[PDB]
Amino acid sequence: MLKEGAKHFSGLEEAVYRNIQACKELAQTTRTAYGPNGMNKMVINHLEKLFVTNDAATILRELEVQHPAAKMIVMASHMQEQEVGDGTNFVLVFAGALLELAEELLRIGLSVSEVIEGYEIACRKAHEILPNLVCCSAKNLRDIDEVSSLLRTSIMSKQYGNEVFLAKLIAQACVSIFPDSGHFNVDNIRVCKILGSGISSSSVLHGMVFKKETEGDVTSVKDAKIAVYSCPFDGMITETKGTVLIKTAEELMNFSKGEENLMDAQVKAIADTGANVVVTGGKVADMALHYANKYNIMLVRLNSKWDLRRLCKTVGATALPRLTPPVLEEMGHCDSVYLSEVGDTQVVVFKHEKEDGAISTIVLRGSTDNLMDDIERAVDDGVNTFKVLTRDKRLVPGGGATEIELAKQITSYGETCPGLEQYAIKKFAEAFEAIPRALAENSGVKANEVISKLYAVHQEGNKNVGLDIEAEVPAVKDMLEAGILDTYLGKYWAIKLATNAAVTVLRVDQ
Amino acid sequence: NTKRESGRKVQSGNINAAKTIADIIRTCLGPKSMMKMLLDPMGGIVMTNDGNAILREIQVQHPAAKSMIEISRTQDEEVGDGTTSVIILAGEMLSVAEHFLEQQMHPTVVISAYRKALDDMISTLKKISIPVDISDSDMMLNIINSSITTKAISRWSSLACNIALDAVKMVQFEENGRKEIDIKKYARVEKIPGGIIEDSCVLRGVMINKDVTHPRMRRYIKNPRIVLLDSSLEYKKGESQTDIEITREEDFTRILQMEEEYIQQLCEDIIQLKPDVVITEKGISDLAQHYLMRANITAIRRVRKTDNNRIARACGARIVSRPEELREDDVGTGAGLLEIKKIGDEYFTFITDCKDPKACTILLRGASKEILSEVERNLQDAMQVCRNVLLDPQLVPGGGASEMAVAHALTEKSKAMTGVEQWPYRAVAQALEVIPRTLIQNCGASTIRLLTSLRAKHTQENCETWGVNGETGTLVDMKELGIWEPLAVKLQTYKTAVETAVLLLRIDDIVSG
Amino acid sequence: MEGPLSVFGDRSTGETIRSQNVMAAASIANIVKSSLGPVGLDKMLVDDIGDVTITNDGATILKLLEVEHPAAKVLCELADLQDKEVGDGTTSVVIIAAELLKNADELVKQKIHPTSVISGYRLACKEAVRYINENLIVNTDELGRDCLINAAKTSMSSKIIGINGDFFANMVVDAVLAIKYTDIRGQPRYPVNSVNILKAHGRSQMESMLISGYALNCVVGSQGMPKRIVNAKIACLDFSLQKTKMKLGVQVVITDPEKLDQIRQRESDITKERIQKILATGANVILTTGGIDDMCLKYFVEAGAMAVRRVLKRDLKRIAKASGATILSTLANLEGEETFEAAMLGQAEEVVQERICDDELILIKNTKARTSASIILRGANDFMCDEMERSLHDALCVVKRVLESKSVVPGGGAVEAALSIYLENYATSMGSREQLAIAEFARSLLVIPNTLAVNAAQDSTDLVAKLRAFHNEAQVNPERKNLKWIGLDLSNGKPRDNKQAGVFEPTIVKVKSLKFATEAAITILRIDDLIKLH
């Protein structure tokens, strides 16, 4: 400060300006990133590799700002993304939008608590009236449509057109195997992206899909006792002496054969422990391969940790470098453990089917990684939006036909509840228009034009914005029934969530 | 030559001046008051509550301020008051609307909102505008003293009450068309120097300071009859133009004196006739005017015909060639009072005129020659009520609860009018409530909460009649508090205010000529 | 400037000055854009410093403005020349010029018979003028369903303050015929401004009363003297009565003031004999010119006279010819001693005094020597009458301009929207140079309405979306009718459904604005070589 002491970068103006303004910075694109999104975002992640998406959290985590303002709220956006797969595209914009009313009320001179608390009780009032606007509930996981109907909404809230083949393909991955009652799992259903085939060739093989080359034979048994190992081959040939191969002419003789019998004992000890599939994040060797061909134990030549991880995760396997006779601790899990060609890529396939614990493994055949990973992104955040763990998701208008109802609900009521809080309560019903704007953003019209008509749709729950021109000229697309609703819950959090950090990040002048 | 200006840039320049002008005077206007003190480059201080007085003494910026002086005048041109209101009121709607609305992008409903925000005033006012008896000096006095107080002055109010309560009723045009609302020549306030408050002596008719200017003139003839020219003055305005002579030095002196010795012979031609007053639009010279006075004939000189005509009807003066030569005499009496008042030996002849063409030029007397100027302003603001009450008995009580009364009825109607239109209409709904809230922010505490209380008060209790006190800040009935906000004034204010701000948006461009 | 600075004298030698021209050309037309159409903003424009002018008329704007370049200069003529044409098309001609003079040179530079290039912007005008002669599809006062009634009603819908256009549709019909004056080429069209029109406060806000014959406004309430005997006749006078000095020629300089008082005393009393000379001729209504002094007035009030004075000479002149009277016959002098003969008497079925609205008029029933009418306007106040009267005037000139040219167009660049893509098509098969010009022509057309659109904040994307959608090969067709909508309402900025509206323009100003626009493409180009002077 004035004094050489007082560590801080936040406060006073730079709070009522820069913090909120820095909060404004990132919500800018989240607008283009939520609901139907025609917008796209190049990102290099410190691979210098471009990637394209509409999602903030993928990007924001990378982005580094002086100020915890940005650094905090993402956690809530994560806290959403943790609990709810999508809407996080939205979860940031409303707070940042709702915030900047304060700095205005600060120019209008409204106190911290005064500005805060109006949003609060209105947020409770929201949390009171928000479930009143539950317009449906989900029903059946076994039904593909009942699932896929919703799933578009989040895929929509990532990317618009693709959602159709996708949402179906998702419940066709059997979101249904899990009850979605107190349980559901990504890693069991895990996306596995095959570069090649088509992007709409993205398929479903229930049970593990490992793009890794499937070696040896097929597993000794399909129940396979599965000993997965980080690097069970560090080489059994040693790299030593002169040439980084040999030094003395007598050296080479012992280098070549030693790999064999060690790996022979190693792959015998794979059979000795009884592993019916051998998984080497370490190298593949033809002898060991032929040993794995002799002992008939299916071989995995190379592993991402994700391989080992999931194998460690799902099978109950434990990946360990073995220069060491393998010992089954990993043991088995999956009742059918296969070789397969999916995308006609050699696909390491383990499968076991259980109401909980079943791997129903999303296999994305795809033409482009940079797409198929963003194609993964929406289905990810779509099935994570499928993750509610209420089979009946108490659905509310998806793509936000809600806000117009609530923008009507609160600020009207907002004045009824009196005192300067009312203005914060009335400011509360404003930033609803964000996604109606944020779609009209990527749709290309004015939120006023939107809201004026979508106030003129009055009590609806249905008509609202979207993509194309029906979010433009009428600003009317049925966001109850385009087939698009959203769960009350993912909605319920964003208000609740974006209530907290927004309220919070204002309070802090240091 | 050709010059081009564009977009927000000028319209923001429009925003700046009037708004910045709207600052001090809004605090100045009303019982809650401040002073705008101009710094002359020499350090000269000029502090007023009239910014238009300060604005002129220094550079007037073109974009907002050049039009605001004129909408300052126009309001004061019309009713006789309100330079300080329209500017801050136009500054209100100018401030928050366009950029916001132009960030919502349209010039149209902005301009269109002024209309429909203007009539909601007209709508909610005349509903809650409270009628007052126009035959009652007092029922007019409470609304007139409210409007005589425009800045600080209740002092001459009660005294400016009585004169105007009397005068504007007697006001008639020379058409005598209607009474009531009037031109300030058919109600004139001429401050008469010196004396004391006792000499204030309400004058309902025209005064002629030139009727009796001298003690030697006509002394108190109850009905003065001004005889126009025509024979009593035969017409010679010319000069003999006598030939040049180098011998006499007097020929240089005498030829110029010949001009005024003609009217002398014409004033000699007057004497025989003894018109008790003589009016000459050609004018009479003073060397000619000697011989009129000694006759006990007063002389109105260098006055026009309409000045005389309205008076010749007001004082009821036969207008003839000669008193003995028939031009068909006008009446002998048009008036009931001829009072010639003297401060010094310059006599002030006041003829109180009842429903006459006259001028209704009203006598005021301050304690001296100076505080007259405020009495005149007091009287003009007083006669403004008396022309407004005799126009509108209904005039809104408010401490600016009227300045809320529209604003909240707007947001009510914003919900009714809808469209994209509501958003300008709801944006311009905000601008009105600031002026009084500033006055009750001049008070203190939370002025927006008082405004919230206002808004809570507004549709619940009453818009304006019941309202907030301006200087106290309490929510009170403004007729009960006695603060009166003339309907026409308010009617004129936003009207005059909405008009200028329409063009300020319409102008993104000026040239150099 | 731009590029080479090496030579003064506005010699930038090619594209530089050419662009410095298109700069100046795009510089001047800008005010017009924001001023284009009735939705064009109104520009307060400083004349000196405190001296200003508030004008939305680019031509008027231009007239205050000065021309700092030939590019600035060549437009400020053609714009004021199209203003000099009518004043319809002022803003029109302005803008398109700035686009075409980067378009014009680009082709005409390449020579290869250099003559005919900008005619690609000319033959297009022809191509347009023809089509512009073809548009009754919108803007018809040529005939409506009620014709000039509904034509004015839709024009009173084009300017509409109220339900006016009920009587006011008929008034404009009454108005064009109220005026009867020699008009050439054989026009039954008669000037719509000269229509005797009177404003009436009170009664109904929206209402009108047509006076049989011209309605002469005659002073009442000032002169209390009776002018009134119900008669068949009026004495139309250009003459004046004064009780101060009726006939001059006396000098205030004379040593005798008696000379000025004498003719004053005598000729003050001759004022009331002149009427007695007129009344004895059989004239019980005698229309006299005013000018009496405020003293002479009250004298004429208190002394009294029989005569109709201070009448409107605009009407008195019209009625003199109308009732067959003259305004002067036996009048050789300013003396009231003059006899009266019936030559100044107007002949009528009856001259009857009807005071209505508390305004007495001289209403000549059966004006004999011509056909005459006056439509008085009943309104709350005369401002309310000012309100509809102006709404009536653009129900008039449109009919007039239609009575000027039966062939018309819808006003605005909507006729371009048809023509433009058509002329771009009319360019297409031409190819070569010629696909460029006529298309480089027609693309530069589009600026007018779209700017006029956004001037109304109409989302110029809309204006093109609506019009050139309807415009097709399906509809290349103006027809006389709407199978497409080629219309654009100017005060709306948006195409409406009004096909009769009075805010449009005929084929008159539009065939002009094309060529003037093609001109500025040429107008700057005539200079041969270039130089600089010392």
Side-chain angles (χ1 to χ4, degrees), chain A residues 132-161:
Chain A
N132 299 134
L133 291 182
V134 166
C135 293
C136 292
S137 296
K139 270 73 185 181
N140 301 131
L141 276 64
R142 314 294 181 270
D143 183 3
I144 306 312
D145 175 65
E146 184 67 14
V147 183
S148 67
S149 298
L150 172 62
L151 297 172
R152 290 175 175 79
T153 305
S154 293
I155 302 175
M156 173 185 73
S157 296
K158 263 68 182 181
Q159 296 305 321
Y160 182 75

mmCIF file of all heavy atoms in Angstrom, chain A residues 132-161:
data_model
loop_
_atom_site.group_PDB
_atom_site.id
_atom_site.type_symbol
_atom_site.label_atom_id
_atom_site.label_comp_id
_atom_site.label_asym_id
_atom_site.label_seq_id
_atom_site.Cartn_x
_atom_site.Cartn_y
_atom_site.Cartn_z
ATOM 1 N N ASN A 132 -39.754 -25.295 -9.003
ATOM 2 C CA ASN A 132 -41.092 -25.056 -9.516
ATOM 3 C C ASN A 132 -41.110 -25.035 -11.035
ATOM 4 O O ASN A 132 -42.140 -25.340 -11.642
ATOM 5 C CB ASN A 132 -41.647 -23.744 -8.968
ATOM 6 C CG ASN A 132 -41.747 -23.746 -7.462
ATOM 7 O OD1 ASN A 132 -41.353 -22.787 -6.804
ATOM 8 N ND2 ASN A 132 -42.261 -24.834 -6.905
ATOM 9 N N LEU A 133 -39.985 -24.693 -11.660
ATOM 10 C CA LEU A 133 -39.865 -24.656 -13.109
ATOM 11 C C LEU A 133 -39.324 -25.958 -13.684
ATOM 12 O O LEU A 133 -39.026 -26.031 -14.877
ATOM 13 C CB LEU A 133 -39.006 -23.479 -13.554
ATOM 14 C CG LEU A 133 -39.740 -22.172 -13.289
ATOM 15 C CD1 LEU A 133 -38.925 -21.013 -13.770
ATOM 16 C CD2 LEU A 133 -41.095 -22.198 -13.972
ATOM 17 N N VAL A 134 -39.171 -26.984 -12.854
ATOM 18 C CA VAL A 134 -38.924 -28.327 -13.357
ATOM 19 C C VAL A 134 -40.058 -28.639 -14.319
ATOM 20 O O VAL A 134 -41.226 -28.674 -13.919
ATOM 21 C CB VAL A 134 -38.856 -29.351 -12.216
ATOM 22 C CG1 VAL A 134 -38.935 -30.753 -12.753
ATOM 23 C CG2 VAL A 134 -37.572 -29.172 -11.435
ATOM 24 N N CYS A 135 -39.721 -28.844 -15.592
ATOM 25 C CA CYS A 135 -40.744 -29.072 -16.598
ATOM 26 C C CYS A 135 -40.921 -30.530 -16.986
ATOM 27 O O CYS A 135 -41.912 -30.856 -17.648
ATOM 28 C CB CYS A 135 -40.445 -28.246 -17.858
ATOM 29 S SG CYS A 135 -40.588 -26.459 -17.625
ATOM 30 N N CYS A 136 -40.035 -31.415 -16.546
ATOM 31 C CA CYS A 136 -40.132 -32.839 -16.829
ATOM 32 C C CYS A 136 -39.267 -33.571 -15.820
ATOM 33 O O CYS A 136 -38.748 -32.985 -14.871
ATOM 34 C CB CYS A 136 -39.676 -33.196 -18.251
ATOM 35 S SG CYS A 136 -40.697 -32.634 -19.638
ATOM 36 N N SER A 137 -39.121 -34.866 -16.045
ATOM 37 C CA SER A 137 -38.105 -35.656 -15.377
ATOM 38 C C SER A 137 -37.631 -36.680 -16.389
ATOM 39 O O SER A 137 -38.355 -37.027 -17.324
ATOM 40 C CB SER A 137 -38.646 -36.326 -14.111
ATOM 41 O OG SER A 137 -39.027 -35.358 -13.153
ATOM 42 N N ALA A 138 -36.406 -37.158 -16.220
ATOM 43 C CA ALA A 138 -35.951 -38.234 -17.083
ATOM 44 C C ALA A 138 -36.659 -39.511 -16.659
ATOM 45 O O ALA A 138 -37.397 -39.515 -15.672
ATOM 46 C CB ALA A 138 -34.436 -38.395 -17.005
ATOM 47 N N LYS A 139 -36.472 -40.586 -17.422
ATOM 48 C CA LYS A 139 -37.194 -41.812 -17.102
ATOM 49 C C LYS A 139 -36.318 -43.056 -17.111
ATOM 50 O O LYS A 139 -36.024 -43.625 -16.055
ATOM 51 C CB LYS A 139 -38.364 -42.019 -18.067
ATOM 52 C CG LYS A 139 -39.679 -41.398 -17.605
ATOM 53 C CD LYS A 139 -39.665 -39.883 -17.714
ATOM 54 C CE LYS A 139 -40.918 -39.250 -17.142
ATOM 55 N NZ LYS A 139 -40.867 -37.768 -17.298
ATOM 56 N N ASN A 140 -35.886 -43.477 -18.298
ATOM 57 C CA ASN A 140 -35.334 -44.810 -18.470
ATOM 58 C C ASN A 140 -33.985 -44.736 -19.158
ATOM 59 O O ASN A 140 -33.872 -44.258 -20.290
ATOM 60 C CB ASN A 140 -36.272 -45.693 -19.291
ATOM 61 C CG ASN A 140 -37.626 -45.835 -18.656
ATOM 62 O OD1 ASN A 140 -38.648 -45.654 -19.313
ATOM 63 N ND2 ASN A 140 -37.647 -46.148 -17.368
ATOM 64 N N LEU A 141 -32.965 -45.227 -18.462
ATOM 65 C CA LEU A 141 -31.653 -45.439 -19.044
ATOM 66 C C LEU A 141 -31.659 -46.468 -20.155
ATOM 67 O O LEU A 141 -30.954 -46.283 -21.156
ATOM 68 C CB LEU A 141 -30.669 -45.901 -17.971
ATOM 69 C CG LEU A 141 -29.973 -44.863 -17.114
ATOM 70 C CD1 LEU A 141 -30.946 -44.090 -16.248
ATOM 71 C CD2 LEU A 141 -29.007 -45.628 -16.275
ATOM 72 N N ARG A 142 -32.414 -47.553 -19.990
ATOM 73 C CA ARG A 142 -32.504 -48.583 -21.012
ATOM 74 C C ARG A 142 -33.023 -47.984 -22.310
ATOM 75 O O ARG A 142 -32.557 -48.336 -23.399
ATOM 76 C CB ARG A 142 -33.418 -49.709 -20.530
ATOM 77 C CG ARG A 142 -33.145 -50.156 -19.089
ATOM 78 C CD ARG A 142 -31.775 -50.822 -18.890
ATOM 79 N NE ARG A 142 -31.598 -51.231 -17.499
ATOM 80 C CZ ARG A 142 -31.072 -50.460 -16.555
ATOM 81 N NH1 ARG A 142 -30.666 -49.240 -16.859
ATOM 82 N NH2 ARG A 142 -30.962 -50.904 -15.313
ATOM 83 N N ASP A 143 -33.977 -47.062 -22.206
ATOM 84 C CA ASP A 143 -34.393 -46.284 -23.362
ATOM 85 C C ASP A 143 -33.226 -45.447 -23.860
ATOM 86 O O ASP A 143 -32.604 -44.708 -23.092
ATOM 87 C CB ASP A 143 -35.575 -45.383 -23.008
ATOM 88 C CG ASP A 143 -36.093 -44.595 -24.204
ATOM 89 O OD1 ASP A 143 -35.575 -44.788 -25.325
ATOM 90 O OD2 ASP A 143 -37.027 -43.785 -24.023
ATOM 91 N N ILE A 144 -32.932 -45.559 -25.154
ATOM 92 C CA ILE A 144 -31.886 -44.727 -25.734
ATOM 93 C C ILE A 144 -32.384 -43.298 -25.883
ATOM 94 O O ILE A 144 -31.689 -42.338 -25.527
ATOM 95 C CB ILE A 144 -31.417 -45.303 -27.081
ATOM 96 C CG1 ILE A 144 -31.006 -46.770 -26.930
ATOM 97 C CG2 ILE A 144 -30.271 -44.474 -27.636
ATOM 98 C CD1 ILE A 144 -30.087 -47.055 -25.767
ATOM 99 N N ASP A 145 -33.609 -43.141 -26.395
ATOM 100 C CA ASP A 145 -34.167 -41.810 -26.605
ATOM 101 C C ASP A 145 -34.274 -41.032 -25.306
ATOM 102 O O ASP A 145 -33.779 -39.902 -25.213
ATOM 103 C CB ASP A 145 -35.539 -41.899 -27.260
ATOM 104 C CG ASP A 145 -36.199 -40.542 -27.381
ATOM 105 O OD1 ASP A 145 -35.667 -39.691 -28.121
ATOM 106 O OD2 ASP A 145 -37.237 -40.319 -26.724
ATOM 107 N N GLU A 146 -34.935 -41.613 -24.302
ATOM 108 C CA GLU A 146 -35.093 -40.942 -23.016
ATOM 109 C C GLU A 146 -33.767 -40.393 -22.523
ATOM 110 O O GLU A 146 -33.705 -39.283 -21.981
ATOM 111 C CB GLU A 146 -35.678 -41.910 -21.992
ATOM 112 C CG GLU A 146 -35.973 -41.284 -20.652
ATOM 113 C CD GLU A 146 -37.090 -40.262 -20.718
ATOM 114 O OE1 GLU A 146 -37.810 -40.219 -21.738
ATOM 115 O OE2 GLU A 146 -37.250 -39.502 -19.743
ATOM 116 N N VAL A 147 -32.691 -41.149 -22.723
ATOM 117 C CA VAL A 147 -31.368 -40.632 -22.418
ATOM 118 C C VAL A 147 -30.935 -39.643 -23.492
ATOM 119 O O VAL A 147 -30.732 -38.455 -23.214
ATOM 120 C CB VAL A 147 -30.372 -41.795 -22.271
ATOM 121 C CG1 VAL A 147 -29.019 -41.277 -21.883
ATOM 122 C CG2 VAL A 147 -30.870 -42.787 -21.246
ATOM 123 N N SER A 148 -30.809 -40.112 -24.738
ATOM 124 C CA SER A 148 -30.291 -39.295 -25.831
ATOM 125 C C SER A 148 -31.023 -37.970 -25.987
ATOM 126 O O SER A 148 -30.401 -36.982 -26.389
ATOM 127 C CB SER A 148 -30.369 -40.064 -27.145
ATOM 128 O OG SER A 148 -31.711 -40.278 -27.515
ATOM 129 N N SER A 149 -32.324 -37.931 -25.702
ATOM 130 C CA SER A 149 -33.055 -36.670 -25.734
ATOM 131 C C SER A 149 -32.345 -35.587 -24.934
ATOM 132 O O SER A 149 -31.933 -34.570 -25.505
ATOM 133 C CB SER A 149 -34.471 -36.874 -25.197
ATOM 134 O OG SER A 149 -35.189 -37.791 -26.004
ATOM 135 N N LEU A 150 -32.211 -35.785 -23.621
ATOM 136 C CA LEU A 150 -31.367 -34.914 -22.810
ATOM 137 C C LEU A 150 -29.995 -34.726 -23.434
ATOM 138 O O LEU A 150 -29.614 -33.599 -23.773
ATOM 139 C CB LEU A 150 -31.214 -35.480 -21.402
ATOM 140 C CG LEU A 150 -30.187 -34.712 -20.565
ATOM 141 C CD1 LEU A 150 -30.607 -33.264 -20.364
ATOM 142 C CD2 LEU A 150 -29.969 -35.393 -19.233
ATOM 143 N N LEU A 151 -29.260 -35.827 -23.615
ATOM 144 C CA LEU A 151 -27.820 -35.780 -23.858
ATOM 145 C C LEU A 151 -27.451 -34.742 -24.902
ATOM 146 O O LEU A 151 -26.391 -34.109 -24.811
ATOM 147 C CB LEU A 151 -27.341 -37.151 -24.314
ATOM 148 C CG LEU A 151 -27.496 -38.307 -23.344
ATOM 149 C CD1 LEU A 151 -27.152 -39.546 -24.106
ATOM 150 C CD2 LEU A 151 -26.573 -38.131 -22.153
ATOM 151 N N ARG A 152 -28.308 -34.560 -25.902
ATOM 152 C CA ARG A 152 -28.098 -33.499 -26.876
ATOM 153 C C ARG A 152 -27.904 -32.156 -26.187
ATOM 154 O O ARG A 152 -26.963 -31.424 -26.502
ATOM 155 C CB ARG A 152 -29.274 -33.470 -27.848
ATOM 156 C CG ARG A 152 -29.278 -34.674 -28.757
ATOM 157 C CD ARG A 152 -30.498 -34.749 -29.644
ATOM 158 N NE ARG A 152 -30.366 -35.861 -30.577
ATOM 159 C CZ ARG A 152 -30.583 -37.134 -30.264
ATOM 160 N NH1 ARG A 152 -30.937 -37.471 -29.031
ATOM 161 N NH2 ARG A 152 -30.427 -38.075 -31.184
ATOM 162 N N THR A 153 -28.748 -31.852 -25.196
ATOM 163 C CA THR A 153 -28.723 -30.540 -24.550
ATOM 164 C C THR A 153 -27.313 -30.141 -24.139
ATOM 165 O O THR A 153 -26.880 -29.008 -24.380
ATOM 166 C CB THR A 153 -29.632 -30.540 -23.324
ATOM 167 O OG1 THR A 153 -30.950 -30.963 -23.692
ATOM 168 C CG2 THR A 153 -29.701 -29.145 -22.715
ATOM 169 N N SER A 154 -26.575 -31.062 -23.519
ATOM 170 C CA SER A 154 -25.208 -30.755 -23.121
ATOM 171 C C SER A 154 -24.263 -30.798 -24.310
ATOM 172 O O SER A 154 -23.427 -29.902 -24.478
ATOM 173 C CB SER A 154 -24.757 -31.722 -22.036
ATOM 174 O OG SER A 154 -25.510 -31.492 -20.867
ATOM 175 N N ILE A 155 -24.368 -31.835 -25.143
ATOM 176 C CA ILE A 155 -23.631 -31.819 -26.400
ATOM 177 C C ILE A 155 -23.952 -30.546 -27.164
ATOM 178 O O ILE A 155 -23.051 -29.861 -27.658
ATOM 179 C CB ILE A 155 -23.945 -33.069 -27.238
ATOM 180 C CG1 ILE A 155 -23.600 -34.336 -26.463
ATOM 181 C CG2 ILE A 155 -23.134 -33.047 -28.522
ATOM 182 C CD1 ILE A 155 -23.994 -35.593 -27.192
ATOM 183 N N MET A 156 -25.240 -30.197 -27.247
ATOM 184 C CA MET A 156 -25.631 -28.879 -27.738
ATOM 185 C C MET A 156 -24.856 -27.785 -27.030
ATOM 186 O O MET A 156 -24.186 -26.973 -27.677
ATOM 187 C CB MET A 156 -27.124 -28.657 -27.524
ATOM 188 C CG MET A 156 -27.595 -27.275 -27.855
ATOM 189 S SD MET A 156 -29.327 -27.068 -27.425
ATOM 190 C CE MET A 156 -29.180 -27.015 -25.643
ATOM 191 N N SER A 157 -24.908 -27.770 -25.695
ATOM 192 C CA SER A 157 -24.201 -26.754 -24.930
ATOM 193 C C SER A 157 -22.702 -26.811 -25.167
ATOM 194 O O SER A 157 -21.986 -25.882 -24.778
ATOM 195 C CB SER A 157 -24.526 -26.894 -23.448
ATOM 196 O OG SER A 157 -25.902 -26.649 -23.224
ATOM 197 N N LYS A 158 -22.213 -27.885 -25.785
ATOM 198 C CA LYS A 158 -20.909 -27.846 -26.433
ATOM 199 C C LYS A 158 -21.047 -27.559 -27.923
ATOM 200 O O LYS A 158 -20.689 -26.472 -28.386
ATOM 201 C CB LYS A 158 -20.160 -29.159 -26.213
ATOM 202 C CG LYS A 158 -19.164 -29.123 -25.070
ATOM 203 C CD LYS A 158 -19.831 -28.995 -23.718
ATOM 204 C CE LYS A 158 -18.783 -28.919 -22.622
ATOM 205 N NZ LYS A 158 -19.354 -28.821 -21.247
ATOM 206 N N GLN A 159 -21.567 -28.519 -28.687
ATOM 207 C CA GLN A 159 -21.638 -28.387 -30.135
ATOM 208 C C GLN A 159 -23.009 -28.813 -30.635
ATOM 209 O O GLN A 159 -23.578 -29.799 -30.163
ATOM 210 C CB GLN A 159 -20.544 -29.208 -30.823
ATOM 211 C CG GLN A 159 -19.153 -28.717 -30.494
ATOM 212 C CD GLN A 159 -18.978 -27.248 -30.812
ATOM 213 O OE1 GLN A 159 -19.482 -26.753 -31.821
ATOM 214 N NE2 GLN A 159 -18.269 -26.536 -29.945
ATOM 215 N N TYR A 160 -23.508 -28.090 -31.636
ATOM 216 C CA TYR A 160 -24.927 -28.154 -31.955
ATOM 217 C C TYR A 160 -25.299 -29.404 -32.748
ATOM 218 O O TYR A 160 -25.982 -30.284 -32.216
ATOM 219 C CB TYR A 160 -25.330 -26.893 -32.715
ATOM 220 C CG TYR A 160 -26.794 -26.822 -33.074
ATOM 221 C CD1 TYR A 160 -27.745 -26.528 -32.108
ATOM 222 C CD2 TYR A 160 -27.223 -27.025 -34.376
ATOM 223 C CE1 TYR A 160 -29.084 -26.452 -32.425
ATOM 224 C CE2 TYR A 160 -28.561 -26.947 -34.705
ATOM 225 C CZ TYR A 160 -29.488 -26.662 -33.726
ATOM 226 O OH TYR A 160 -30.824 -26.586 -34.045
ATOM 227 N N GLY A 161 -24.869 -29.507 -34.006
ATOM 228 C CA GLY A 161 -25.407 -30.512 -34.913
ATOM 229 C C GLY A 161 -25.063 -31.953 -34.603
ATOM 230 O O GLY A 161 -25.930 -32.824 -34.724
#
